[PDB]
Structure of Major antigenic peptide PEB3:
Amino acid sequence: DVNLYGPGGPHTALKDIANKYSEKTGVKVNVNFGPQATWFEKAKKDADILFGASDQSALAIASDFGKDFNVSKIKPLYFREAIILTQKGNPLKIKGLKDLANKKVRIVVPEGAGKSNTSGTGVWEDMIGRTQDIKTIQNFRNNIVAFVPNSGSARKLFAQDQADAWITWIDWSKSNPDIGTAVAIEKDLVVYRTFNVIAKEGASKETQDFIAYLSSKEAKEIFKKYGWREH
Amino acid sequence: DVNLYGPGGPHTALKDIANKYSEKTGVKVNVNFGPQATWFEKAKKDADILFGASDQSALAIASDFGKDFNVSKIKPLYFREAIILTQKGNPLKIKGLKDLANKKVRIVVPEGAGKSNTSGTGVWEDMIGRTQDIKTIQNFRNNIVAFVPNSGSARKLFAQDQADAWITWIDWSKSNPDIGTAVAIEKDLVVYRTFNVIAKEGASKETQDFIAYLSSKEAKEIFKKYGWREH
């Protein structure tokens, strides 16, 4: 049994994959996902691979495992763009990031605030900062109704219609076409973050083989289905 | 006495500003700077203002102060661009981030890893990610010889000639012109992060007065000479 731990998000692609791989290879692959705290303890007992939704978060998470893992072995495999998720039908007619700053709107972004490891940390300031206008940066920040510890928390706040816009990743929208309406971010502002994996110290051949499979022709197309790219 | 606490970096601009302000007003303004741990205990006692070197790190640090501060009051005032700091003379002829990915170089970057609050978190991946090329991202990451807790840790590693390139901020070069040679990052890739301030809850009239002064014509020009912009 090859066991994987990581955040919600990439788990959808990974489930499709471990299930196909399980079929064809007979090897059982478990994909555990969610907020770190929800799986941390089981994962300390039997984690074979930690997967991540960005580099800074995977580095944080892998570091929490002591010498069970080796953070320097983190392998970036795909990337996807950030998006704006608006409520169904985009009632406020949001056109992008600059539009969020200029309008009266409620924004949720995941920010770890140094106590939670989340793919969101640093995204919004890096995107809106590329406008190089402090006024727009200021106006955007003022529209932020909540900084949440992780993507799951943002999704929840969002589904309760307490935010008009959620700064998230394309895969989240691909994985959950029912949630909201996706709005593309200005090409000159958007950031792209990565999917990665790291095998435990002393990982089995079965593990290694599954990692190798994540780069297979068939894994690439499944990741691609969810918006994950190589180029 | 108005007491400010924050990271090294913006401290240089703030030192000049504070000096000039005391001259005019007779109000004593102390600028305490360094890694959070070196000043956290004292600040919990007398901090009037927390200043920041990015938004995510400022949100993290201000959160550590609990009920004394209300993090929604963080004020972005200026931004500056990330840079590549190469050893004096730029012996390896580095021309930007793509060049780093391609050459055999040793790069140092500040990354909090969830256990330290630093302006560097998320920076390298957001810049090199905008190449939208996984091999480039992979190649850049393979050249990173050290992920350090903060900018001061990177400065020291760099000063000991243990890194060829340090991904930092223009202000670190402006404040330390002899320390190395700054290489401009490609326009389509570079990120800009902010200087910010937050007054403690129940801040004095004089504390607020100094904050206002940070947006004065005089402060603007001092901020400008260290690379902090508006525009």
Remarks:
- The two ends of chain B are 32 Å apart (CA to CA).
- The first strand of chain B starts at residue 2 and ends at 6.
- The CA atoms of residues 1 and 27 of chain B lie 7 Å apart.
